[PDB]
Ligand binder design. Structure first.
Ligand SMILES: [Mg+2]
Ligand SMILES: [Zn+2]
Ligand SMILES: [Zn+2]
Lengths: 49, 49, 56, 49, 38, 299, 168, 65
RNA sequence: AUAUCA
């Protein structure tokens, strides 16, 4: 069915940026701990909490 | 007065290599206050970058 | 997290795809948008802790 | 597509819209620790490693 | 007061495309053979 | 570690680093839960932090093999510092300070390697050879500038860095027979191919010439054509044969000058090898200009 | 206070030495070994101590002793605090100043602001958020992978026993 | 780099049309808009595919191995 | 340490 509205449509130059979900997503539930403080390690990289 | 013993090449060679590498624009592995970030790794994400 | 509303208790809904999905009307308290924002999830480990979340 | 999100034509994505190549490079050295100790490139055996 | 050569002193890093760099007087086809991007 | 439940002699266990557990691969029993990241933990000792802002950076790496265990900071200038107290606390370190100063003979080895264009692995062998033989009664009273000149050839002879004894005679100093006896009392506690790259480079020859000279010299030895001549002479002679065979020639005077040999001596080896010139050359050598095997000087 | 804090106890005569947990060591590869800045700073205190002890024992040259005392004074002092106003910092070979005890507690990222008053935690997860007109107000879309990692410890009970056995 | 087979938006094969387009320009001197249209590329989604292509492959080929 | 992300 026709839309009651008319859509502004045409080509536009879009860029793909360096931020992708899969390089961001992270989850932890017990993992590596620091030596000194005996607390969870830092960063996604290190499987930190 | 042996010439090779007199002039230490490593002085200027590694002295420049340090600055350019690390980025602490000063002498040398004992740097502060030295200005860090003077030399940095060239962004190669896109040509414009 | 300058608000008590910046940390709220939600019902899990396991879904596909790598993003945390939220109802749009809950956007405002968190102060979130989808321009590349990330969010934190904490899981209670006790019946007591769970109650705290669900009940308060 | 609410609050800065967008909808993509999954059909177009299949046709190659916005795909990209990705290359990561891993490095490793075979370091020499003094007169005797030397790291080695080899397939480690789980009994003696 | 009566009176009774060329020495190496160090290695200086060159900036690419400068006078001292090999790539300065390089043509397009030249760079390609050198596996550089024009 | 070995699983308390199973106990099989080859104890098959995995380090599930990602879940921070140490598991028995057979029964699945977790054998440990506290598990630490050694990479990031080592980042706290050897970092990139020279400024002093990193709260993670809290220690420093040392070298127990070379300097033993001498932990010691240095009184120096900080942000809020009077130049007076630095001097006093440093003039106070002077009264507390002989052998803790003979470590500046490492600075003699480091400044010699860098003057001899030697790698970072050679210095650390020369410093370990010197630390384990400078207080020996077997060396007793040898020329103290010729026992560290001998421990540099000891460090080069393990790190595979080709350095003739006459190459270290040019650095310092060396008295030949004096640092030759010292190079043996410590030892109780080169070849043709070695020189060829450098000599050829100075000679300005092409890779083709270098390779052939290198092949001839080896064959000369293999053939045992030169009974006991010094390898340097053999190499210089072989370089003469190959080069003469190719277009860019080099004369005995020029080869000898680079090799640091005498034309007469190069002549001596050369003529010995010449008879078997055919056998000596690489098989796909291309004599050029006008120098074929028949035509080579033969001198 | 006569029991817990007599003024005589402010001037240090004996030095409590903290155990390795407070100043961890690491043994890398037999020619690489890492000691904590405190272990360094302690060794200086000790060395400066052993020195001054020998001076007093021997022929005390008065002014060569007080010279060695105000060195000891510095090492002990700089160990608890390296950021002292007026005094030179104790530096560690690489040019970086020694991480004193004060400085470990001090800032945000200190032991207080950053290991006690806030700390990283397990049973945590993070990713890019996106909206959904089909989720209920109070729910949260959780990616399968995130659900498969995060865990709830449930006690085996007559009520859940069968269900739990199945997930197992 | 290297002509896309099929227009992203509608999937009309555009893989064959490249050389033919480049030819209608050098050999026929024709303007871009007519060449595209000659080649039957009527919808702008299809037009943008050829019109805005950058055949980087040709530079890539300039390197030896 | 610099760069960056909302
Ligand atoms: Mg935002
Ligand atoms: Zn087991
Ligand atoms: Zn189309």
């Amino acid at each position: 069915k026709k839309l009651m509205a008319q859509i502004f449509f045409g080509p536009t130059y879009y860029q793909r940026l360096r931020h992708m979900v899969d390089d961001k997503i992270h989850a932890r539930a017990r993992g590596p701990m620091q030596v000194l403080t005996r607390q969870p390690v830092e960063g996604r990289s290190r499987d930190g909490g | 007065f042996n010439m090779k013993l007199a002039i230490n090449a490593k002085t200027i060679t590694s002295g420049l290599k340090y600055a350019l590498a690390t980025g602490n624009w000063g002498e040398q592995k004992k740097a502060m206050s030295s200005r860090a970030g003077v030399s940095q790794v060239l962004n190669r994400y896109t040509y414009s970058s | 997290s300058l608000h008590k509303m910046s940390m709220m208790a939600h019902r899990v809904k396991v879904i596909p795809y790598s993003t945390f999905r939220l109802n749009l009307s809950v956007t405002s308290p968190y102060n979130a948008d989808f321009d590349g924002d990330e969010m934190n999830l904490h899981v209670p480990q006790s019946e007591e802790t769970r109650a705290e979340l669900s009940q308060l | 597509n609410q609050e800065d999100s967008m909808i993509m034509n999954q059909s177009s994505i299949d046709r190659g819209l916005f795909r990209s190549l990705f290359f990561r490079s891993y490095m490793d050295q075979e370091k020499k620790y003094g007169m005797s100790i030397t790291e080695t490139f080899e397939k480690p055996q789980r009994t003696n490693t | 007061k009566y009176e009774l050569g060329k020495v190496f002193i160090g290695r200086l890093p060159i900036m690419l495309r400068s006078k001292n760099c090999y790539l300065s007087e390089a043509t397009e086809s030249d760079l390609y053979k050198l596996k550089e991007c024009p | 570690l070995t699983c308390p439940e199973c106990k099989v002699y080859p104890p098959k266990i995995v380090e599930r680093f990602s879940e921070g557990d140490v598991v028995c691969a057979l029964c699945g029993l977790v054998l440990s839960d506290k598990l630490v990241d050694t990479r990031s933990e080592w980042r706290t000792f050897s970092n990139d932090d020279h400024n002093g802002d990193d709260p993670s950076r809290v220690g420093e790496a040392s070298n127990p093999l070379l300097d033993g265990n001498n932990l010691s900071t240095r009184i120096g200038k900080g942000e809020t510092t009077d130049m007076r107290f630095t001097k006093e606390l440093n003039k106070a370190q002077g009264k507390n300070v002989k052998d803790n100063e003979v470590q500046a003979a490492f600075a003699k080895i480091t400044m010699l390697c860098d003057a001899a264009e030697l790698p970072k692995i050679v210095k650390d062998c020369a410093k370990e050879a010197y630390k384990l033989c400078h207080d020996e009664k077997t060396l007793k009273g040898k020329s103290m500038e010729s026992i560290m000149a001998a421990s540099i050839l000891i460090g080069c002879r393990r790190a595979e860095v080709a350095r003739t004894f006459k190459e270290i005679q040019s650095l310092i100093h060396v008295k030949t027979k004096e640092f030759g006896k010292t190079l043996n009392i410590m030892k109780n506690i080169a070849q043709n191919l070695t020189y060829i790259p450098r000599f050829c480079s100075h000679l300005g020859l092409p890779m083709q010439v270098t390779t052939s000279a290198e092949y001839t010299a080896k064959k000369c030895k293999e053939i045992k054509e030169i009974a006991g001549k010094s390898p340097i002479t053999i190499a210089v002679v072989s370089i003469y044969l190959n080069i003469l065979l190719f277009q860019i020639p080099i004369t005995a005077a020029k080869v000898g000058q680079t090799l640091q040999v005498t034309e007469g001596t190069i002549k001596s080896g050369y003529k010995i090898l010449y008879e078997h010139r055919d056998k000596l050359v690489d098989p796909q050598l291309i004599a050029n200009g006008v120098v074929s095997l028949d035509n080579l000087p033969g001198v | 206070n006569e029991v817990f804090s007599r003024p005589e106890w402010m001037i240090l005569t004996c030095l409590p030495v903290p155990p390795p947990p407070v100043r961890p060591s690491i043994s890398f590869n037999e020619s690489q070994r890492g000691e904590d800045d405190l272990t360094f700073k302690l060794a200086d205190i000790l060395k400066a101590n052993i020195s001054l002890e020998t001076l007093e024992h021997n022929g005390a040259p008065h002014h060569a002793i007080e010279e060695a005392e105000s060195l000891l004074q510095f090492h002990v002092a700089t160990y608890m605090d390296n950021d002292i106003a007026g005094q030179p910092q104790a530096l560690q070979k690489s040019g970086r100043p020694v991480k004193s005890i004060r400085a470990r507690l001090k800032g945000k990222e200190g032991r207080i602001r950053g290991n006690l008053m806030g700390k990283r935690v397990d049973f945590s997860a993070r990713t890019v958020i996106s909206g959904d007109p089909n989720l209920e107000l109070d729910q949260v879309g959780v990616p399968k992978s995130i659900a498969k990692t995060l865990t709830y410890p449930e006690v085996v009970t007559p009520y859940n026993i069968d269900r739990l056995t199945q997930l197992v | 780099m290297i002509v896309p087979v099929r227009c992203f938006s509608c999937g009309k094969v555009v893989g064959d049309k490249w050389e033919s387009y480049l030819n209608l320009l050098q050999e026929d001197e024709l303007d871009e808009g007519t060449a595209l249209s000659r080649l039957g590329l009527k919808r702008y989604c299809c037009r943008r595919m050829i019109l805005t292509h950058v055949d980087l492959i040709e530079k890539f080929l300039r390197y030896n191995p």
